[PDB]
């Protein structure tokens, strides 16, 4: 049971090794648009938080799950930020989420005061007062119920079928990362020019014993002019200086 | 009418006749096919379904084939009961509508 | 031993309505959705509708806005009502039973068939 | 005198400011279904041609003034296109007509 | 085309099944249209192709 679009889930993904090769055994995926990353290189990167949102939508609105879009899904049901670096996955589920005789359990909000902020979730059911007069909880003329149920008969065109959507959104940067792909570690060598990767930091240089002190909250002190100069192993906590 | 079937076919008892039905990715390239036999003056019955399985009450001399966006039914050794109309069936999801679409059918007889 | 029986029909003037029955027997009524299919003579077949035998229904969109269905799971019957008939709707209607789950499935029991016609 | 339904008027609306805030001083409007537009935003949009059709009908056929409907009004008296972006307004007039 | 029949243009009218696109066959084996072999002698149920 995916949740309906006005009240979407949000699974926070904690520490793991994340094989994305899976997620490639579910269907043809009517879509699959990775935005900040390219999907062929996901199994070799470290991310800090991977937020997975999940909902259902009609088929002609799958193009509205994108950064900076308009229409009655992206304005006020689910707003992606313009600083987006995730991946939008969407596949048809007319064989599961739609029954004969109307499926009145998928609803979308069509009237609101104004738009949402990015990643904003509302579960309000207060009657939007369009007209100048109050109608005090009794809908009708110039004040309507805000959550309208979808249709999802099976005999609807593609473009009115229930499409399930999972939006992955994850940021890679400060802090550790916690969750990273399967890269298979490797023996650490010292005093040799090598090609190194320290939990996401890709570079070249000679590794040497340092004399700097990162405090348990520090992961890699760059130098003046903003270039990485020291790192701390990802499973030993040894501080090592780097130099071209 | 979106499906494509030959309008007629003929043969002799002891011959292998194939009746095809070719469609599209919406029609066939994404949803099993089913074969129904209409004898004149009756209701339709089952012949073959699921491209590998056959129901009861039928000799398995009828066979099913599927090549991409096409399917067909094969009959070796005709009899006098095989002068009938044959239809293939498939679900389809189209832009204008969606539903349970049929073939045109083929009338098969012996002179 | 499992059969879907109907009512014999007659000539009807155009613009009128037509309620036709489909009585199910021999098995569990609320276990199998019902297909309604239609065939004009000298033409192919086209299916009308699909019915939850205890629930709702859905329709083929080429034949929307003129067909209604009703279940009646006490004397084990479903019904088809077609109003504003025309002269090109002269056909024979079969009432088939489907597989126990949703729309995709084989059509094993079939109706005897009903003749629908218009004349003067 | 509204015209009867088989021979409906058609007023083409030329240049002129439309106080959308009016048309809200006539009754309860048994209906008021805006299809392509949402009626709270009408006072901030530019339109090119505003065709106003006008007729009378019975009360159980007001649901047939919609894109893609059937019945003896929508089949052959007045057919709305399936590419509709207007607004259907309907109110009772048993006290007049 | 010549007067008196031109018997040097032939077409194959009986086969097992269809061809693939751009498929060429020069077979002259007698198609068996029955439930009993006729071992290279045509006639009833098995014809020259
Ligand atoms: C991750 O697991 C590895 C298992 O190999 C840990 O490596 C061992 O850590 C212990 C504790 O210091 C050492 O005594 C062993 O010698 C290490 N193994 C090898 C092969 O060197 C590693 O410490 C773990 N990392 C974390 C952060 O828990
Ligand atoms: C939190 O606040 C934001 C904006 O102030 C609002 O959109 C959201 O609904 C709030 N969440 C809860 C659970 O109240």
Author numbering:
A (entry chain A): 346 to 589
B (entry chain L): 2 to 112
C (entry chain H): 1 to 120
D (entry chain B): 346 to 442
E (entry chain C): 443 to 491
Copy the relevant paper text.
The spike (S) protein on the surface of the virus particle is the key protein for the virus to invade cells. The S protein is a trimer containing multiple domains, of which the domain that directly binds to the receptor angiotensin-converting enzyme 2 (ACE2) is called the receptor-binding domain (RBD). The neutralizing antibody is an important protective barrier against viral infection.
